[PDB]
Amino acid sequence: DSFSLLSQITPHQRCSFYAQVIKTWYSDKNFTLYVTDYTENELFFPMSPYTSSSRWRGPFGRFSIRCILWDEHDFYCRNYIKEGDYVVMKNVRTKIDHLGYLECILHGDSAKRYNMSIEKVDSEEPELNEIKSRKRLYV
DNA sequence: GGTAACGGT
Secondary structure (H helix, E strand, C coil), rough: CCCCCCCCCCCCCCCEEEEEEEEEEEECEEEEEEEECCCCCCCCEEECCCCCCCCCCCEEECCCCCEEEEHHHHHHHCCCCCCCCEEEEEEEEEEEEECCEEEEEEECCCCCCCCCCCECCCCCCCHHHHHHHHHHHCC
């Protein structure tokens, strides 16, 4: 497959992309990431500069997306993928949450039917230059 | 599957 900017993704179509992890949270059910590539998407949650946790080091407005990791993806990443990290995510499922916003899902797939993956990208890879340059323009 | 843009587990 080929990669999309997060501006370009749509619901209920699998997609692949590079992003920076802004926030992580593991729970007894799953592992949740909130990631950005500093491109805007009209179906993304508008993050408030006002009501957001002071911890949030990400952008505001429709710039970030929730990724929910289940099962093997939970187990793999929950103590591994850190806030601030870069990741490449491949063939992940997209849908709409209860409030109308786009989100990413990595569901259990022991057969690797859909060839989903998530892996860290070393900070120094050129594949991450764009995110970096778009962040500069953002700040 | 969880369902909200918390927490810091």
